[PDB]
Amino acid sequence: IGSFNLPSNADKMVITFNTMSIPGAEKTISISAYAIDPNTARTALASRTN
Amino acid sequence: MYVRTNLTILSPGWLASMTSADGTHAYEMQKSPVLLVSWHGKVMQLKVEG
Amino acid sequence: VPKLPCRVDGACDATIIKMMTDLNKKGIKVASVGQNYLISIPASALFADQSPRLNWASYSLLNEIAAFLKQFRKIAITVTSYSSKYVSVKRERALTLARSRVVSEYLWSQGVDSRIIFTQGLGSDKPITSYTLGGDRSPNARVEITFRRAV
Amino acid sequence: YGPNAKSMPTEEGIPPSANDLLLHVLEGVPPPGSRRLVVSGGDARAWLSNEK
Amino acid sequence: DGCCSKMGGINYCDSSAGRLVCNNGFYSTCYCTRHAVMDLQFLMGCCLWHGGVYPQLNSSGLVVCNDGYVSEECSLQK
Amino acid sequence: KETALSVGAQAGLAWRAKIIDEQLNKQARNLDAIYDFNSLVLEHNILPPVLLEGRNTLNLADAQSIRISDRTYKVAKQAHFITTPPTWRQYLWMDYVKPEAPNVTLLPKTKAEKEIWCIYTERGWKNGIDQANTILEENIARIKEDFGGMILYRKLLAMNMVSPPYVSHTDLGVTGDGSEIHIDDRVLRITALPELNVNSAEWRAAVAK
Amino acid sequence: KETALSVGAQAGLAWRAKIIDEQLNKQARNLDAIYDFNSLVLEHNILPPVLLEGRNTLNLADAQSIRISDRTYKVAKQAHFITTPPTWRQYLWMDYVKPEAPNVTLLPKTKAEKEIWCIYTERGWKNGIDQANTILEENIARIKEDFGGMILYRKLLAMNMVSPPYVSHTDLGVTGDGSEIHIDDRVLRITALPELNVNSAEWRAAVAK
């Protein structure tokens, strides 16, 4: 579970993902990390921009 | 028969046995006039009357 | 279906029925009572005349009858040979035993997975036709394979 | 025996006879609390109660 | 597909032998219940002939059967 | 999704159960003919107990410990009094409830959805069928077990290897105060439960001809 | 890249496992005729023990210090009960499951990427094949060592150097209370584990013709 960011310019988007939980036993770690494009090595979003 | 020794009885059988820490064995077993024992690797007969 | 086998491997009822009708059209006797099956083959179309020798065409018949016999799950097979009264008792008896040995050996080399192959021959003790004019051509001399399909 | 009797000797006797739930298992009554099991390839049933 | 094909046809699935009954009185070549007699020789699965697969969620790629012996082909390759 | 599969499993369980109860009701008379109990009842309206016999048993207790027994006998349920012969309807009659709730959320809209709907529904259906048959065979096994134990008690009593039940009754005339009266008093008690014997002389060997 | 290597190793390992298992199952009967065990078990169904043989052993401790033994004998695994003869199936079978999980990460984009994906899968296939071959050879060495220890014990007991195991049995009549009975009880114990002697007199030699 997390959220996204709002950049100054709309050529990209990053994702705020921190709420990481492994099931089964009652635990939930708090690791936050950032996002890169799979298979393209970028930091943007695949959508339209016009 | 209640027989106490340091030998170990092999052939004619037993029902209850107590082995202590020092090396003494007490056998509670069914009545029999002929016993078979082994002194640490050698085999002998025990003939007990009554 | 992906792990459960739907039918028994290497058998089809249409194949069984068609090849059984082909055998009956060939004239080899085929009979089915209950869970039991009896196949009777005349001696003249199989062996040499009163002698344990094989024509080269007979291997084709043995081939197709083994292919039919692989279609059923089996447990025990019995092979029994019958002859004509020719010279003695024991000559005919040993001829029957040799014939049974040859056919049983070739079947056991072929693909029937029987747990048991029993083989014996009795010469000319029990006939099935009182008309005994012919020699090896007469139908009272033959071989039979009898077996029971189980479960 | 006093308070520091460390060498208490080993006591043993008759092994157990048999496990008595096998009667119910043999007859066809599954034991209490068990789970059903799936058997493929034959005419058999099975159960699991206590990791046995 | 037709278990009693080119004959009388399907009667019912007898659960005693686990077989279809053809309308002509023969037991079919097919099967209909899992409690039948199949010639089973080949299997799937991992940690066989041991305690089975221990079903816990492991931190690593190691997977060990319940007897303590491991299976490196069940484990990954690194 | 899987909801169609689960509700189809429920529906198949219900339909197989209804047909099973129909067939079990329709075959009626021979059922209670073969499962008599009132012919098997004892003297004082006592339900006779149930016995279990095991033959040729081996136990491995652990590494290097084995025990071998020839025949073992066990009393399962202790006998007691009763007022009615038990019948098979408290062993075999399955429950039934019509499932009236197909949850109208995941109705199909495309033909692929219809396809997966159909296939998941039928495999759930066959799951429910097999589950119902499993319940039925467990019930028939348990009632077979009960009757087998009862008749084994009967033949052990024939073979003189169990004590019969023992009963004392006490008798009184009129009792009570001037406002509440009873004409008679019969108090019926059992002191000795039926049980196995351990000695060697009383064993009664059988024969046939 | 790394995905290609991982799935190449997995697919090669699985396919080689399938081929080896199929060959091993197809040659079935002579395998069991070779590794019979039931023609080796003793009288009381005790599995005979495992022994090991070493000849002309030299140990250098350090300088000014060496020891030489002409022959060594080691007990490996103690003899104990079995309720079944073991087979080769728990020693020779290997597990197998086709992995079908591709997750496209280092993307096959160009034809160059497609072919480097191909050749990395090729070398992964090579590695998986060699891994499976190594595992199979390790297992067959293991079963060879076990059976060799067994038959070595048999010939040593023939050679009169290992004491045979010794077993008592104790009988009991009808047992238990009036609730549970057993007809006869027999308890089978052993006392002497088999072991090697040290005396010089009891040795026996053999000579053929």
Find where tokens 């009701």 sit: F25
Instruction: Choose among C144, C146, C113, C127: nearest CA to C43.
Output: C144
- Using CA atoms, how far apart are residues A11 and G194, in angstroms rounded to an integer? 82
Dmax of chain E from CA atoms? 60
> Which helix (H) or strand (E) segment is G61 a member of?
strand G50-62
Paired tokens of C66:
């083994």
SS3 per-residue string spanning chain A: CEEECCCCCCCCCCEEECCECCCCCCCCECCCECCCCCCCCCCCCCCCCC
All residues of chain A having their beta carbon less than 8 Å from the beta carbon of residue G104 are 39
Paired tokens of A38:
């799979």
List all chains that touch chain E, counting a touch as 3 or more CB pairs closer than 8 Å. Answer: C, D, G
Query: How far is B10 from chain G, CA to nearest CA, in Å?
Result: 5
Reported for C108-116, long-range contacts at CB under 8 A and 24+ positions apart, including other chains, are: C110/C62, C110/C63, C110/C66, C110/C70, C111/C66, C111/C70, C112/C66, C112/C69, C112/C70, C112/C74, C112/C77, C113/C70, C113/C74, C114/C74, C114/C75, C114/C76, C114/C77, C114/C147, C115/C75, C115/C76, C116/C75, C116/C76, C116/C77
Find where tokens 């129909």 sit: F22
Q: What DSSP string describes chain C?
A: --SS-SB-TT--HHHHHHHHHHHHHHT-EEEEETTEEEEEEESTTTEETTEEEE-TTHHHHHHHHHHHHTTS--SEEEEEEE----S-SHHHHHHHHHHHHHHHHHHHHTT---SEEEEEEEESSS-S-S----STTSTTSEEEEEEE---
> Are the CB atoms for C104 and C44 separated by under 8 Å?
no
All residues of chain D having their beta carbon less than 8 Å from the beta carbon of residue E34 are 38-41
CA G181 to chain centre: 42
Resolution number, Å: 4.6
> Are the CB atoms for G124 and G6 separated by under 8 Å?
yes
Nearest to D13 among B16, B19, B20 (CB): B16
Nearest to F196 among G173, G178, G187 (CB): G178
Question: Cβ contact (<8 Å) for D14 and B18?
Answer: no
Query: How far lies B47's CA from each of B44, B50, C116, F67, G67, in Å?
Result: 10, 10, 57, 29, 47
Q: What DSSP string describes G73-137?
A: EEEEE--EE-SS---SHHHH---B---------S---SHHHHHHHHHHHHHHHHHHHHHHHHHHH
List all chains that touch chain C, counting a touch as 3 or more CB pairs closer than 8 Å. Answer: E
- At CB < 8 Å, which residues of chain A contact G? 38-40
Q: Residue C20 half-sphere exposure, CB side, CA atoms within 13 Å?
A: 15
Query: How far lies E44's CA from each of C31, D38, E38, E74, G11, in Å?
Result: 42, 16, 16, 12, 15
Question: Cβ contact (<8 Å) for C151 and E17?
Answer: yes
Q: What DSSP string describes F154-171?
A: HHHHHTT-BPPPEEEEEE
All residues of chain E having their beta carbon less than 8 Å from the beta carbon of residue C3 are 44
Query: How far is G163 from chain D, CA to nearest CA, in Å?
Result: 26
Question: Cβ contact (<8 Å) for G168 and B10?
Answer: yes
> Are the CB atoms for E44 and G94 separated by under 8 Å?
no
Angle, helices G111-158 vs G2-26, to 10°: value is 40
Paired tokens of G62:
């350090």
Nearest to E42 among G6, G25, G128 (CB): G25
